[PDB]
């Protein structure tokens, strides 16, 4: 089961903002400035942008 996704239609379920992703929690976007990746090398940590489910590489 993915509660965020209707697999029959490949549409998000009612109320859902996202189905998957480091910035998705219980089908909702995590807030802008949430750390979504703790850098494993020398780069900066990456952050959620509030409006997308992905974890973009820090500019």
């Amino acid at each position: 089961a993915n509660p965020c996704c209707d697999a029959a239609t490949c549409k998000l379920t009612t109320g859902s903002q996202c189905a998957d992703g480091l910035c998705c929690d219980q089908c909702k976007f995590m807030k802008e400035g949430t750390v979504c990746r703790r850098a494993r090398g020398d780069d900066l940590d990456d952050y959620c942008n509030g409006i997308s489910a992905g974890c973009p590489r820090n500019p």
Partner: protein
């Protein structure tokens, strides 16, 4: 649903559609196929070749 990745709510690779009268095994049905018979004084409705959705009304 072989057409949908339930984890991500994205279409699976090779899949063009997840459902619809003009969707067959995750692929678009060919342009021209009659997909709905008109009930009134209208021509029949036909797949576009570019969507899984059968038209419902003539523009």
């Amino acid at each position: 649903n072989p057409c949908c990745d339930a984890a991500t709510c994205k279409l699976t690779p090779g899949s063009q559609c997840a459902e619809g009268l003009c969707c067959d095994q995750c692929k678009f049905i060919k342009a021209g196929k009659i997909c709905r018979r008109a009930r009134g004084d209208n021509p029949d409705y036909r797949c576009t070749g570019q969507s899984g959705d059968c038209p419902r009304k003539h523009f």
